[PDB]
Write a protein that binds this ligand. Structure first.
Ligand SMILES: COc1cc2cc(c1OC)O[C@@H](C)CCn1cc(nn1)CCCOC(=O)[C@@H]1CCCCN1C(=O)[C@H]2C1CCCCC1
Length: 128
């Protein structure tokens, strides 16, 4: 499925080229602009453990998930991945534990050394 396709054909967007954050663009956005550190960003997302044992959607809240980019308000893989996205874009990310919750995890919700998958839609971003 989606996670396996990202393993096989996904772009490595880490600085370290360690395959810790892999990306496929599923729908292209608009304009050239991508968000800067500090920008307020608005997204819809669906997320799961790679084996599918916990599943979370912003659609379950009916409302966008909102955060300031690059302030570590989310896991490092989102700061990395969303910074690459254009307004309107939908992308898949597959993420190793080092760019998510690591060997400590976040129990009971996230186990130790968990790989994560997300589908992300970038709705908008606005300057500080
Ligand atoms: C580790 O705890 C959680 C992880 C995730 C979601 C969590 C959560 O409980 C705080 O709550 C959901 C269920 C309620 C909405 N929400 C998101 C956040 N705070 N509240 C932000 C929490 C930080 O989350 C993240 O950095 C990432 C990226 C942003 C969206 C949510 N993220 C998650 O890791 C989910 C997680 C995805 C994998 C399946 C299980 C949930």
């Amino acid at each position: 499925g989606a996670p396996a396709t990202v393993t096989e054909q996904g772009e490595d967007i880490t600085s370290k080229k360690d395959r810790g954050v892999l990306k496929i663009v599923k729908r292209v956005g608009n304009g050239e602009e991508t968000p800067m550190i500090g920008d307020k960003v608005y997204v819809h997302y669906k997320g799961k453990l790679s084996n599918g044992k916990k599943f979370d959607s912003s659609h379950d809240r009916n409302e966008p998930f909102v955060f300031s980019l690059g302030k570590g308000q989310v896991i490092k893989a989102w700061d990395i991945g969303v910074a690459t996205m254009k307004k309107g874009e939908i992308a898949h990310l597959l993420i190793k534990p080092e760019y998510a919750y690591g060997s400590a995890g976040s129990l009971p919700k996230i186990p130790s050394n968990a790989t994560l998958f997300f589908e992300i839609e970038l709705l908008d971003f606005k300057g500080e």
